[PDB]
């Protein structure tokens, strides 16, 4: 990259109708249960999950990398207890992008104790362009975006030791 700068786009506390709190001990900080730092896990608030919306019009003068995710539960029980509803959907749209994802509820082998999964997707939001998040559940929202620039590409090297 020529330039890479992490900026806040959809602040954690902007969701007044949902629960920004939440995580598991599979992702643990100081023994306490936690979650991905730059991500927000939207659950139900007041025993109700009204459709969560969010948008960001890009003005940082650069192209922006934005990452989101959806939750694939292990069973109907966690689907109901967390997002209050079944038959939910996650919708992300920009000028170029139109992507819709659904929760896939099924029992899977345990990885870090969980049978559930979190599937992430990403995009490059152009300058002066808006992004639109819209979900009735299972959305794992970005709190941050990444300004980016490229003069050209490179590679990834495995060494195990010492930059001099």
């Amino acid at each position, epitope marked *: 990259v020529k330039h890479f700068e992490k900026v806040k786009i959809l602040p954690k506390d902007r969701w007044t109708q949902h629960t920004t709190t939440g995580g598991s001990r599979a992702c643990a900080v100081s023994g306490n249960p936690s979650f991905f730092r730059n991500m927000v896990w939207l659950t139900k*608030k007041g025993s109700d999950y009204p459709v969560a919306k969010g948008s960001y019009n890009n003005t940082s003068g650069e192209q922006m990398l934005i990452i989101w995710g959806v939750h694939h539960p292990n069973d109907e029980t966690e689907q109901r207890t967390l997002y209050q509803n079944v038959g939910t959907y996650v919708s992300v749209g920009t000028s170029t992008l139109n992507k819709r994802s659904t929760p896939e509820i099924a029992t899977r082998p345990k990885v870090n104790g969980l049978g559930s999964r979190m599937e992430f997707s990403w995009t490059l939001l152009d300058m002066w362009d808006t992004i639109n998040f819209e979900s009735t559940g299972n959305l794992i929202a970005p709190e941050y975006g990444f300004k980016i620039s490229k003069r050209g590409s490179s590679g990834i090297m495995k060494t195990e030791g010492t930059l001099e």
Partner: antibody
Amino acid sequence: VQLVESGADMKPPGSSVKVPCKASGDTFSSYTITWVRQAPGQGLEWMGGITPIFGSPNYAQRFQDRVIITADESTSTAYMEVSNLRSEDTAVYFCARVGGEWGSGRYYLDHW
Amino acid sequence: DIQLTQSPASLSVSPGERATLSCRASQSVAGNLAWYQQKPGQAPRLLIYGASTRATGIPARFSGSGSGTEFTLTITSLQSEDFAVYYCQQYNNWPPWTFGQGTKVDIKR
């Protein structure tokens, strides 16, 4: 792990109770406290449950709106409050914990 | 709306006569079934979960078995503390906290 609660409560009909449930041991509080009820001589019945991180607790169809469940993660204690009692509400109120961690599929009650 | 019925309601078995209990569900709860032991005047103790594997601190007389609609609980040689009430809990269909009425085991004479 020890879930310890208050014992022996005596209340008039039309009054409210609040049964505390303190969690001693290794407190995760990403784990779900479940409230179960047992009328004298009868079986067990799920009243609801709460997971402190996620907030927003569940209630069974029967005890919905007749009861409310809260939690203080700072005191490691979960409360089951019965608004407006009746003579038929005389029973034992257990607080249990589950295998925990939504997505594990282990929703048995391992502690009491 | 899973229905859980335990038969027999009461079981009469001698100390060491190998008591066997049975829980049956209206639909298939697959491999997810638990067994609890409640001794009179006390809270339930977790015995079996996943229909087969047994909880921590539980002696090996207690053996779970079965899958689908019909399950089973086995106690090889009974004991003093083993005369109580036993419940089965399904956990497949929401809500996963439906219970069975229970089976009461007493001393056969």
